[PDB]
Amino acid sequence: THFGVKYELWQPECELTAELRKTAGVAKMKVNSDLNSFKTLELTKMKLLTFAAKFPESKEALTLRALEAALNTDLRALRDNIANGIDRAVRATAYASEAAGALFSGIQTLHDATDGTTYCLSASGQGSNGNAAMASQGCKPLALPELLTEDSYNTDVISDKGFPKISPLTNAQGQGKSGECGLFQAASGAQATNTGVQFSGGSRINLGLGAIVASAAQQPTRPDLSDFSGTARNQADTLYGKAHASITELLQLAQGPKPGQTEVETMKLLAQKTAALDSIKFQLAASTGKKTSDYKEDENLKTEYFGKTESNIEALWNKVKEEKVKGADPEDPSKESKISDLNTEEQLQRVLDYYAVA
Amino acid sequence: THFGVKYELWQPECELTAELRKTAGVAKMKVNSDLNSFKTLELTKMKLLTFAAKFPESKEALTLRALEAALNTDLRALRDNIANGIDRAVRATAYASEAAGALFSGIQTLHDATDGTTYCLSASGQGSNGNAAMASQGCKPLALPELLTEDSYNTDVISDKGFPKISPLTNAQGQGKSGECGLFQAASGAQATNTGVQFSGGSRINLGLGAIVASAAQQPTRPDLSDFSGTARNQADTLYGKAHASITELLQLAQGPKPGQTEVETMKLLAQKTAALDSIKFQLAASTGKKTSDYKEDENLKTEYFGKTESNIEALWNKVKEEKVKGADPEDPSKESKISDLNTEEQLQRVLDYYAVA
Numbered sequence: 001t002h003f004g005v006k007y008e009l010w011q012p013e014c015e016l017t018a019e020l021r022k023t024a025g026v027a028k029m030k031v032n033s034d035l036n037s038f039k040t041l042e043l044t045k046m047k048l049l050t051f052a053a054k055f056p057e058s059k060e061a062l063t064l065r066a067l068e069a070a071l072n073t074d075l076r077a078l079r080d081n082i083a084n085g086i087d088r089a090v091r092a093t094a095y096a097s098e099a100a101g102a103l104f105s106g107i108q109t110l111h112d113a114t115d116g117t118t119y120c121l122s123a124s125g126q127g128s129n130g131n132a133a134m135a136s137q138g139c140k141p142l143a144l145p146e147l148l149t150e151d152s153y154n155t156d157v158i159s160d161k162g163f164p165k166i167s168p169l170t171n172a173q174g175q176g177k178s179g180e181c182g183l184f185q186a187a188s189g190a191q192a193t194n195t196g197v198q199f200s201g202g203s204r205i206n207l208g209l210g211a212i213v214a215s216a217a218q219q220p221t222r223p224d225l226s227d228f229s230g231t232a233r234n235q236a237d238t239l240y241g242k243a244h245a246s247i248t249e250l251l252q253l254a255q256g257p258k259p260g261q262t263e264v265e266t267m268k269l270l271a272q273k274t275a276a277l278d279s280i281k282f283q284l285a286a287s288t289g290k291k292t293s294d295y296k297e298d299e300n301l302k303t304e305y306f307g308k309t310e311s312n313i314e315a316l317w318n319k320v321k322e323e324k325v326k327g328a329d330p331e332d333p334s335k336e337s338k339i340s341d342l343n344t345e346e347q348l349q350r351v352l353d354y355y356a357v358a
Numbered sequence: 359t360h361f362g363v364k365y366e367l368w369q370p371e372c373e374l375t376a377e378l379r380k381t382a383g384v385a386k387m388k389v390n391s392d393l394n395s396f397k398t399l400e401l402t403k404m405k406l407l408t409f410a411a412k413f414p415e416s417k418e419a420l421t422l423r424a425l426e427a428a429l430n431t432d433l434r435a436l437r438d439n440i441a442n443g444i445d446r447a448v449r450a451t452a453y454a455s456e457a458a459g460a461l462f463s464g465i466q467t468l469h470d471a472t473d474g475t476t477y478c479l480s481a482s483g484q485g486s487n488g489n490a491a492m493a494s495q496g497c498k499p500l501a502l503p504e505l506l507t508e509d510s511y512n513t514d515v516i517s518d519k520g521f522p523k524i525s526p527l528t529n530a531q532g533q534g535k536s537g538e539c540g541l542f543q544a545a546s547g548a549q550a551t552n553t554g555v556q557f558s559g560g561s562r563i564n565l566g567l568g569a570i571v572a573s574a575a576q577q578p579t580r581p582d583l584s585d586f587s588g589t590a591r592n593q594a595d596t597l598y599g600k601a602h603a604s605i606t607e608l609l610q611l612a613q614g615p616k617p618g619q620t621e622v623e624t625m626k627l628l629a630q631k632t633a634a635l636d637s638i639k640f641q642l643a644a645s646t647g648k649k650t651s652d653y654k655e656d657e658n659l660k661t662e663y664f665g666k667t668e669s670n671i672e673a674l675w676n677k678v679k680e681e682k683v684k685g686a687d688p689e690d691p692s693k694e695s696k697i698s699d700l701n702t703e704e705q706l707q708r709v710l711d712y713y714a715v716a
Contacts, residue, residue: 002550024452031444035437056714065711072707079396086389086444091502093451094382098500101459101597105567109467115559118550142456142597144449182549182556187540192360192476195543196553201473209463209499239459239499282708283715286691293689326644330636331651333644349430350640353423356414357641
């Protein structure tokens with residue numbers, strides 16, 4: 001009788017507390033890479049535009065403008081995707097954090113119902129002092145780090161199904177050391193006249209919003225939270241269920257358009273977007289007094305301009321990267337710099353203004 | 359003896375919960391306002407660019423190119439602020455939610471120590487049934503709505519100094535109705551062999567991670583969580599402190615650049631910024647093969663192009679908006695439209711591509 005709560009019950013709840021706390025970081029890491037993509041794509045569509053501003057009349061410029069119309073749809077995709085990412089990061093950080101809070105408060109109640117001699121939280125090996133392992137298992141006050149880096153949760157603690165290690169403990173197996181704790185002992189009568197909870201007429205010790213319940217004398221039970229589709233289906237609607245759905249809505253969020261490792265891949269990838277072919281057709285139609293419906297030779301157009309397996313794009317990049325252009329320096333507009341070495345939107349906006357007036 | 363917890367200790371805590379739960383909505387609107395600004399301004403930069411594409415050598419094309427260079431530093435500023443918003447928005451939701459989770463947790467516990475006759479939370483006016491008033495006061499499960507609509511925390515519930523209404527209760531003030539709850543009744547000896555907490559050796563009933571502590575039998579208390587700068591300084595590093603700190607750091611990030619109510623006001627404002635005039639000075643040196651440093655006549659340069667009190671700018675717009683431009687028909691690049699009709703970015707990227715090819 002007089003049982004502490006077993007280590008095997010509370011420890012997986014501290015381990016899950018530490019993990020849920022990772023949502024803040026994972027959540028910004030997602031939104032931050034669509035922003036980083038927009039930073040790199042912006043720079044690439046301006047190394048393509050400064051060349052096209054220099055030789056407006058050529059066909060390199062025609063192709064570079066098609067590639068730019070595709071890059072501009074890509075950037076509208078990233079920009080409008082960010083509003084979704086913000087909303088999924090915030091909700092998944094609220095549910096996950098109310099869940100890590102409730103879990104921690106519940107085990108704190110147990111840690112403080114000690115008297116220096118015996119403890120309501122048992123150690124492993126039915127040891128009495130579980131209070132001394134609490135912090136090392138992640139039940140610890142929240143102090144978010146300086147660097148919110150993190151993209152990943154350990155999938156053995158949080159996975160796509162639920163929290164795998166939160167297997168149910170039904171009665172008598174959430175029991176830790178005997179002769180330690182008087183919280184789960186049934187009152188000698190109704191609570192109006194007695195001490196403790198009577199575990200009758202619906203009286204229970206519910207700690208941590210369902211995370212440790214005892215509806216019956218001397219048996220602390222943890223719920224099944226390991227698979228909100230499979231075994232744990234009924235807990236799908238609990239705080240812990242909602243919290244898990246949020247972490248999957250979050251993890252299943254799509255990153256918007258992303259650059260390649262080099263510019264020739266970003267350009268090849270752009271060359272395959274239909275926004276590219278559409279711009280070839282519109283600019284051809286415009287330069288020759290035709291309609292855009294006069295150009296329906298799709299693959300023939302694609303091979304002329306981009307090449308089979310985009311074989312023309314490596315070379316087009318090699319042309320753009322070496323071109324010396326003017327305007328980059330703000331004091332002296334006639335100083336020339338190569339496009340490969342021009343790496344800021346301020347510089348690149350100056351070269352484009354330069355030719356716009358030149 | 360055998361008291362429930364008093365409404366004046368628990369209800370303020372339920373409302374603080376529902377208030378902290380606004381952080382999601384609030385944080386989301388702070389970042390979303392910057393994105394909506396970016397969206398509206400990018401359309402307007404397209405609309406500037408079409409007139410300048412048509413007449414690339416007017417005084418106007420110079421004026422509008424300058425205006426887009428002012429507008430471009432703004433969008434970079436807006437991108438800086440969104441990135442900075444994501445980080446503040448997620449940390450404040452993380453902290454304000456561990457706090458709401460912990461608060462509802464502890465009070466949930468008092469809720470479930472009933473037998474359907476007496477109650478461990480007292481109703482208003484020392485009544486028995488606090489259990490039925492709970493959700494109405496804010497203690498209910500987290501159900502985030504569709505459309506986190508929020509800009510408005512209530513200030514007397516969450517100030518710039520702390521959480522006002524939660525005034526310390528120190529000994530008898532937590533006690534609700536007697537002859538109701540045997541939770542705070544001392545155990546009749548060592549908890550190792552008696553029922554309850556005896557409150558010796560250091561045993562308190564610690565609920566809500568600090569929000570409801572009974573360190574002595576008969577009597578529930580609450581911290582001073584109302585001034586982490588002065589009055590409650592000691593509580594600043596608790597979860598409730600940190601939560602208050604992060605919510606405050608969130609609200610301390612200023613909104614970034616915003617459009618005017620009309621493009622005419624967006625333009626008047628841009629005329630007033632330094633990068634517009636830095637642009638004019640650049641353009642002209644580039645034309646006249648000299649340096650930007652030779653153009654020291656700031657306010658009269660400003661006068662020619664922008665106008666005294668801008669003034670001229672309002673006409674610059676009304677003349678751009680009426681201009682017939684070509685390129686906006688997907689199919690027939692010769693059909694003409696007024697720029698005040700080209701409102702998607704797809705029609706306007708087409709106009710730009712048209713004059714580039716033509």
